[PDB]
Write a protein that holds these residues in place. Structure first.
Motif, PDB file in Angstrom:
ATOM      1  N   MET A   9       3.397  12.469   5.744  1.00 29.98           N
ATOM      2  CA  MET A   9       4.764  12.032   5.501  1.00 29.98           C
ATOM      3  C   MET A   9       5.506  11.781   6.820  1.00 29.98           C
ATOM      4  O   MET A   9       6.438  10.975   6.871  1.00 29.98           O
ATOM      5  CB  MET A   9       5.514  13.062   4.640  1.00 29.98           C
ATOM      6  CG  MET A   9       5.017  13.148   3.182  1.00 29.98           C
ATOM      7  SD  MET A   9       5.073  11.570   2.259  1.00 29.98           S
ATOM      8  CE  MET A   9       3.430  10.951   2.506  1.00 29.98           C
ATOM      9  N   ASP A  10       5.098  12.475   7.883  1.00 26.17           N
ATOM     10  CA  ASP A  10       5.713  12.276   9.192  1.00 26.17           C
ATOM     11  C   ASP A  10       5.169  10.976   9.768  1.00 26.17           C
ATOM     12  O   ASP A  10       5.844  10.295  10.541  1.00 26.17           O
ATOM     13  CB  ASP A  10       5.387  13.422  10.158  1.00 26.17           C
ATOM     14  CG  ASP A  10       6.112  14.704   9.814  1.00 26.17           C
ATOM     15  OD1 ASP A  10       7.285  14.636   9.387  1.00 26.17           O
ATOM     16  OD2 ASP A  10       5.514  15.785   9.985  1.00 26.17           O
ATOM     17  N   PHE A  11       3.940  10.636   9.395  1.00 27.10           N
ATOM     18  CA  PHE A  11       3.342   9.402   9.871  1.00 27.10           C
ATOM     19  C   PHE A  11       4.084   8.232   9.238  1.00 27.10           C
ATOM     20  O   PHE A  11       4.360   7.235   9.901  1.00 27.10           O
ATOM     21  CB  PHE A  11       1.862   9.323   9.496  1.00 27.10           C
ATOM     22  CG  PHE A  11       1.224   8.007   9.842  1.00 27.10           C
ATOM     23  CD1 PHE A  11       0.865   7.712  11.152  1.00 27.10           C
ATOM     24  CD2 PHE A  11       1.028   7.038   8.862  1.00 27.10           C
ATOM     25  CE1 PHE A  11       0.319   6.464  11.482  1.00 27.10           C
ATOM     26  CE2 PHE A  11       0.485   5.791   9.183  1.00 27.10           C
ATOM     27  CZ  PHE A  11       0.132   5.505  10.490  1.00 27.10           C
TER      28      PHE A  11
ATOM     29  N   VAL B 252       0.781  -1.238   0.000  1.00 26.33           N
ATOM     30  CA  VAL B 252       0.000   0.000   0.000  1.00 26.33           C
ATOM     31  C   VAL B 252       0.813   1.289   0.000  1.00 26.33           C
ATOM     32  O   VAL B 252       0.266   2.367  -0.244  1.00 26.33           O
ATOM     33  CB  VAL B 252      -0.955   0.051   1.220  1.00 26.33           C
ATOM     34  CG1 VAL B 252      -1.871  -1.158   1.216  1.00 26.33           C
ATOM     35  CG2 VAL B 252      -0.155   0.109   2.514  1.00 26.33           C
ATOM     36  N   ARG B 253       2.109   1.180   0.276  1.00 25.21           N
ATOM     37  CA  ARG B 253       2.988   2.343   0.332  1.00 25.21           C
ATOM     38  C   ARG B 253       2.854   3.276  -0.872  1.00 25.21           C
ATOM     39  O   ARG B 253       2.582   4.468  -0.719  1.00 25.21           O
ATOM     40  CB  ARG B 253       4.445   1.895   0.458  1.00 25.21           C
ATOM     41  CG  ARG B 253       5.407   3.022   0.786  1.00 25.21           C
ATOM     42  CD  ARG B 253       6.836   2.515   0.901  1.00 25.21           C
ATOM     43  NE  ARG B 253       6.937   1.351   1.784  1.00 25.21           N
ATOM     44  CZ  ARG B 253       6.725   1.369   3.100  1.00 25.21           C
ATOM     45  NH1 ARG B 253       6.398   2.498   3.720  1.00 25.21           N
ATOM     46  NH2 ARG B 253       6.824   0.242   3.798  1.00 25.21           N
ATOM     47  N   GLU B 254       3.049   2.720  -2.063  1.00 25.27           N
ATOM     48  CA  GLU B 254       2.976   3.476  -3.307  1.00 25.27           C
ATOM     49  C   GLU B 254       1.767   4.407  -3.422  1.00 25.27           C
ATOM     50  O   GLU B 254       1.916   5.628  -3.437  1.00 25.27           O
ATOM     51  CB  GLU B 254       2.994   2.505  -4.489  1.00 25.27           C
ATOM     52  CG  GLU B 254       2.951   3.167  -5.855  1.00 25.27           C
ATOM     53  CD  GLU B 254       3.206   2.176  -6.977  1.00 25.27           C
ATOM     54  OE1 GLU B 254       4.323   1.607  -7.017  1.00 25.27           O
ATOM     55  OE2 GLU B 254       2.293   1.964  -7.811  1.00 25.27           O
ATOM     56  N   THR B 255       0.573   3.833  -3.506  1.00 24.67           N
ATOM     57  CA  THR B 255      -0.633   4.636  -3.633  1.00 24.67           C
ATOM     58  C   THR B 255      -0.755   5.675  -2.515  1.00 24.67           C
ATOM     59  O   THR B 255      -1.060   6.841  -2.778  1.00 24.67           O
ATOM     60  CB  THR B 255      -1.889   3.751  -3.632  1.00 24.67           C
ATOM     61  OG1 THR B 255      -2.103   3.218  -2.318  1.00 24.67           O
ATOM     62  CG2 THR B 255      -1.721   2.599  -4.621  1.00 24.67           C
TER      63      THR B 255
ATOM     64  N   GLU C  30      -0.817   9.862  -3.096  1.00 27.90           N
ATOM     65  CA  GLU C  30      -1.938  10.629  -2.565  1.00 27.90           C
ATOM     66  C   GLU C  30      -1.596  11.692  -1.516  1.00 27.90           C
ATOM     67  O   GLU C  30      -2.070  12.828  -1.603  1.00 27.90           O
ATOM     68  CB  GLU C  30      -2.963   9.658  -1.974  1.00 27.90           C
ATOM     69  CG  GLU C  30      -4.266  10.294  -1.514  1.00 27.90           C
ATOM     70  CD  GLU C  30      -5.025  10.952  -2.655  1.00 27.90           C
ATOM     71  OE1 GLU C  30      -4.859  10.502  -3.810  1.00 27.90           O
ATOM     72  OE2 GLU C  30      -5.795  11.906  -2.398  1.00 27.90           O
ATOM     73  N   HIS C  31      -0.776  11.326  -0.532  1.00 27.22           N
ATOM     74  CA  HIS C  31      -0.432  12.241   0.557  1.00 27.22           C
ATOM     75  C   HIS C  31       0.980  12.806   0.581  1.00 27.22           C
ATOM     76  O   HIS C  31       1.451  13.239   1.628  1.00 27.22           O
ATOM     77  CB  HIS C  31      -0.694  11.553   1.895  1.00 27.22           C
ATOM     78  CG  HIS C  31      -2.056  10.948   2.007  1.00 27.22           C
ATOM     79  ND1 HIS C  31      -3.208  11.704   2.013  1.00 27.22           N
ATOM     80  CD2 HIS C  31      -2.450   9.658   2.134  1.00 27.22           C
ATOM     81  CE1 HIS C  31      -4.255  10.906   2.141  1.00 27.22           C
ATOM     82  NE2 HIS C  31      -3.821   9.659   2.218  1.00 27.22           N
TER      83      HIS C  31
END
Lengths: 254, 254
Positions: free
Chosen positions: B224-226, B209-212, B216-217
């Protein structure tokens, strides 16, 4: 008098247990379950069962794992029986018994893949065994021992007195785990042995040999006190089982 | 800033995990192994999985045990996904999800045969859950929860700081067992979850799921900090895994 286990000759306590398969609670399921927590072994693995007695539990261990298994016991009569059973089980090539001390094993440092021991035939204590048997176990190898433990913070004086005499090092499960970890093993798992390990696989089998034993030693006062003693332990279980039992502890040498 | 898990909206932390099957370490083998310690159930058994999340672990539990399983979670988005998966798994007749609090369950006293919970989706604490969920469990019923625990008496400051922030109630295994027993359950068993519960079933799935998610964010600083945060937790594991992990604790209400 004769109310304590410490009141009997060792050649005496063993003249009775050599008639049994197990000198303590246990079962094929409990052994199988402890094995589910260690790494799979090959035929070249080296395993040691300390205080094996007549080998009843050692043969079930041989059904669930591969490798050369050496059973060790102090009493030569038990070892003689152990090798007879391995012969009767057609596995005396990979399952062998030898006499020896539990606190000075006949192995090299880091020679074993697995150390096994189920409460039966003398005891050197949980903490002492954890620390002393370590040297013989390969790093990453496993240890799996079953031991009588307290299941509550406090119990009735009757059961406490009994154990403070039979095995004073008996403690709550948390303490055993703490001792396993300090001895350098990751505390992989613990589980309480089902009741049948006591009734079906330990107490019942004794009902079989009772007859002949009594006929033979009915004249011996020390022998009849030993019997009343075993019967006392059986009744102590039905009465205080919610306060104590056997626990299998499995750990991996770090 | 943004270095602590407490620094993120709840609707935010969940907008990410709803993309995953598990919100915490676990596996079919670990679930199957915990089940080997409880009593067999019938189709009429009532089971509750507290803090079920999207239900990944709940469906594996349904493969090993019979009975009506009710998954409970705080976040409605997770429950919506939970029921979708039960539908996709053709078992929405016996596996249902509902929204609700973990500290005030929608059940009658002594209504359940089994209480289940694997660290994911908020937490009320080990001790508190042990004592509060008790009332809902039938006597003799079982509870089985997996939790992050310390594996040693002391660890490097980095991993300690991390947990004293993420989950301050984290303790050594002996303390968890002690708390289980004081809450009125016989401490049946405990076992450390194999590494694959972390890498294969928890971290890896996140690589998918990283890519999508990033596409998106990528513009959202908090998002990005998450992500850097989750990546930090993954690297903390490879580095300090010998000091901590997940442990399954199984107990029987007395």
């Amino acid at each position: 008098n004769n109310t304590s286990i410490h009141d009997f000759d060792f050649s005496f306590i063993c003249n009775y247990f050599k008639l049994l398969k197990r000198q303590g609670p246990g079962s094929p399921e409990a052994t199988r379950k402890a094995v589910s927590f260690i790494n799979e072994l090959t035929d070249d693995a080296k395993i040691a069962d300390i205080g094996c007695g007549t080998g009843g539990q050692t043969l079930f261990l041989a059904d669930y794992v591969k490798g050369q298994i050496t059973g060790i016991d102090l009493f030569p009569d038990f070892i003689e029986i152990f090798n007879e059973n391995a012969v009767k089980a057609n596995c005396a090539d990979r399952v062998k018994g030898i006499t020896g001390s539990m606190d000075n094993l006949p192995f090299q440092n880091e020679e074993l893949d697995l150390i096994w021991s189920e409460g039966a035939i003398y005891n050197i204590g949980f903490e002492r065994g954890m620390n002393e048997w370590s040297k013989y176990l390969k790093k990453g190898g496993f240890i799996a021992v079953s031991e009588a433990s307290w299941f509550t913070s406090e119990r009735p004086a009757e059961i406490e007195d009994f154990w403070m005499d039979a095995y004073p090092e008996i403690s709550v499960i948390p303490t055993c785990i703490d001792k396993m970890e300090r001895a350098g093993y990751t505390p992989t798992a613990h589980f309480i042995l089902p009741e049948n390990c006591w009734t079906e696989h330990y107490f019942a089998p004794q009902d079989e040999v009772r007859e002949t034993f009594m006929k033979e030693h009915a004249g011996n006062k020390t022998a009849m006190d030993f019997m009343k003693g075993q019967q006392y332990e059986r009744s102590l279980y039905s009465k205080y089982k919610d306060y104590y039992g056997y626990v299998f502890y499995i750990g991996q040498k770090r």
